[PDB]
Amino acid sequence: NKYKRIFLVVMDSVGIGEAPDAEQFGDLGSDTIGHIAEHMNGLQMPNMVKLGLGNIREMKGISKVEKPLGYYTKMQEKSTGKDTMTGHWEIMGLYIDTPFQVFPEGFPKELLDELEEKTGRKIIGNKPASGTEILDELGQEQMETGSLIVYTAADSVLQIAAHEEVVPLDELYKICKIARELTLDEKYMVGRVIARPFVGEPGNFTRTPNRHDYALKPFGRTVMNELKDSDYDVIAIGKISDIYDGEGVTESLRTKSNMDGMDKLVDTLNMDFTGLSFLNLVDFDALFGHRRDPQGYGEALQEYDARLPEVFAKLKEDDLLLITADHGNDPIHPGTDHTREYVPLLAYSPSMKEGGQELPLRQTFADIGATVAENFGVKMPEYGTSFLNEL
Ligand SMILES: O=P(O)(O)OC[C@@H]1CC[C@@H](O)O1
Ligand SMILES: [Mn+2]
Ligand SMILES: [Mn+2]
Ligand SMILES: [Mn+2]
Numbered sequence: 001n002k003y004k005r006i007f008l009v010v011m012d013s014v015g016i017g018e019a020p021d022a023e024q025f026g027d028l029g030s031d032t033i034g035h036i037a038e039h040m041n042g043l044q045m046p047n048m049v050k051l052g053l054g055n056i057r058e059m060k061g062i063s064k065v066e067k068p069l070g071y072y073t074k075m076q077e078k079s080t081g082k083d084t085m086t087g088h089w090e091i092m093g094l095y096i097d098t099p100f101q102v103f104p105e106g107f108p109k110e111l112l113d114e115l116e117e118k119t120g121r122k123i124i125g126n127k128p129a130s131g132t133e134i135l136d137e138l139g140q141e142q143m144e145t146g147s148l149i150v151y152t153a154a155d156s157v158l159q160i161a162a163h164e165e166v167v168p169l170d171e172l173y174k175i176c177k178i179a180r181e182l183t184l185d186e187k188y189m190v191g192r193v194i195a196r197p198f199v200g201e202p203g204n205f206t207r208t209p210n211r212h213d214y215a216l217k218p219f220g221r222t223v224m225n226e227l228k229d230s231d232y233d234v235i236a237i238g239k240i241s242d243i244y245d246g247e248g249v250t251e252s253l254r255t256k257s258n259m260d261g262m263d264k265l266v267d268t269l270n271m272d273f274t275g276l277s278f279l280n281l282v283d284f285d286a287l288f289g290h291r292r293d294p295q296g297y298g299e300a301l302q303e304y305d306a307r308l309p310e311v312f313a314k315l316k317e318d319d320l321l322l323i324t325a326d327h328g329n330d331p332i333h334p335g336t337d338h339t340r341e342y343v344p345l346l347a348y349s350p351s352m353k354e355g356g357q358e359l360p361l362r363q364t365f366a367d368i369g370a371t372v373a374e375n376f377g378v379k380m381p382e383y384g385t386s387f388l389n390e391l
Pocket of ligand 1: 129132154
């Protein structure tokens, strides 16, 4: 192999400007990093800059350099949707025609009617909400009626909450599996169904660790499947294992924040493995993008950038670092949904002794998967063009 270990970092939702098909999505004018840079009166990301971020696009406080550490370009999304699952599935070599849906005004009556009809239970709520808000509002009614609290969020999720002393946990999991089957339907395609059992009394409800997620498997065998099947290490950090429903994952490392995600990246740099270490930094999307909080988003990006020099110091000659994103989520955009954007691509190895150059624009995110596959000599994915030879 040209590289013994590839470290792939997805900065979740960190877009680099509206994509060519942004109009279809109502995303004209969107620009995640650019709007954040403007809000911050200049972003301080000196390490991403040294890698060549500004060489991709100059933005406030983000300038090009004469000799970037590695290679740089951006990527265009080919799949129909702009959600996290679509983006990650494309990265690992797939093409996804059918988008996952988001539900800002709740779920269609048709879907909820069929769920009631199958479960023998009434449904209440049906709106985007955090776990705490919805329980305060509807927990007592749930307890008294044996109802199900069905709710959503800014991402493609259907969440079902029930008190553990009113609806048995095993019954809640059965209900969620029914909902998982019903939501495999393009009219109401949700990324994930989530059991949200809770306990306590009115004015003091607590969600329990008995939460269970019901994810869909990627629509195809990914490069991660192929890596795993050829006995390579595939170390998933953060939401990565969940995003792929465990497909192709050999070890999974849970994280609780972006700084924790960088600590686990460092842990994998200290492991003797051959194959892929794959980090998702999710705070960008989950805490700041959807909440339309450009200040918190800007601070998070600066906090992330300050961690990078330790990553640089630990990379070996036969290590490759890849930094990218899976869509945009512009924190100064209308509504609460993602935005259809190009995503940056930075490719760095210490063996690049004369620095890098511009790569041709990646026409699908799957060029990442093709590059990984070619590096490790596994079956090339159906989609994507490797840039391994350009490095
Ligand atoms: O605890 P919360 O605010 O209800 O977060 C729920 C998450 C947010 C998006 C989806 O992952 O579900
Ligand atoms: Mn929009
Ligand atoms: Mn995402
Ligand atoms: Mn999101």
